[PDB]
Amino acid sequence: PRYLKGALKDVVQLSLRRPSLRASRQRPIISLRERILEFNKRNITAIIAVYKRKSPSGLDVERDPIEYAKFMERYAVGLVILTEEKYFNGSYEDLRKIASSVSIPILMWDFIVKESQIDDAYNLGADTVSLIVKILTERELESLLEYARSYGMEPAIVINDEEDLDIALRIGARIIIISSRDLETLEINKENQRKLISMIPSNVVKVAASGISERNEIEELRKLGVNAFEIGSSLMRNPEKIKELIL
């Protein structure tokens, strides 16, 4: 991984030791990227709803993962399921239960630093995984990206600054998540998020993440070329808010 410090260094060290699992995938790969593009063509707002029980940026919410995913299946373009355990209270069992229950695309969000974590995502039923530029070297990014594609997965590349975006382009990213939240400081900077979006080629699928809570924000980001919107804590607290955000 990169040279890190503090809690980011901690979660990366823990992820390096994450025990792998054994299971049989019993699901096709259902591409998040393609379904975004399909929603864009049908002029349907594409919201990726996040399931996360805990985070550094919110209070805990303990709610049924299957109900949440079944409710979201009718509205969301895909689901993001947290599997990081210490800081997000996620689990691979959340992802397994949800993947077994619904047929929309699923992104496993975790600090992916080794190949066995991509095996775990594939074997559990995730369609894609988050590759976070803040923690991975160029060499690690290129290698894990190729390994995920060997399973037929197209990872989402997570960025929050210009240097991250340059690396995401260098590695041939096809879907980028532009998060307005800095993973180390938890600051939300939407001016920087718009500047990053303006520098991404038109043929890369763009997902805006963090701090989105209003239909007016979505409309304005769509007009700037954003293709989909990752929305977490607002929907964890009030899942049915998705109906209004898509209207």
Minimum distance from residue 90 beta carbon to Na ion (Å) = 7
| Cβ proximity to Na ion, 89 vs 192, nearer residue | 89
Report the residue from 5, 17, 41, 223 that binds Na ion according to the rule CB under 5 A.
17
Cross-strand pairs, 78: 48
**Which range touches Na ion (CB under 5 A), out of 16-24, 123-131, 132-140, 154-162?**
16-24
Minimum distance from residue 27 beta carbon to Na ion (Å) = 18
State how far the Cα of 54 lies from the Cα of 74, in Å rounded to an integer: 24
Residues in contact with Na ion, shown as a per-residue x/- string from 78 to 107 under the rule CB under 5 A: -------------xx---------------
- Helix crossing, 138-150 with 162-170: angle to 10°? 50
| Cβ proximity to Na ion, 73 vs 85, nearer residue | 85
Report the first-to-last Cα separation within the chain, whole angstroms: 41
Query: Rounded to 5 degrees, what are φ and ψ at 179?
Result: -90, 130
What contacts 232, CB < 8 A, 6 or more positions away? 49, 50, 52, 55, 58, 80, 209, 210
Minimum distance from residue 10 beta carbon to Na ion (Å) = 16
22 binds Na ion (CB under 5 A): no
Minimum distance from residue 118 beta carbon to Na ion (Å) = 14
Count of residues that bind Na ion according to CB under 5 A: 3
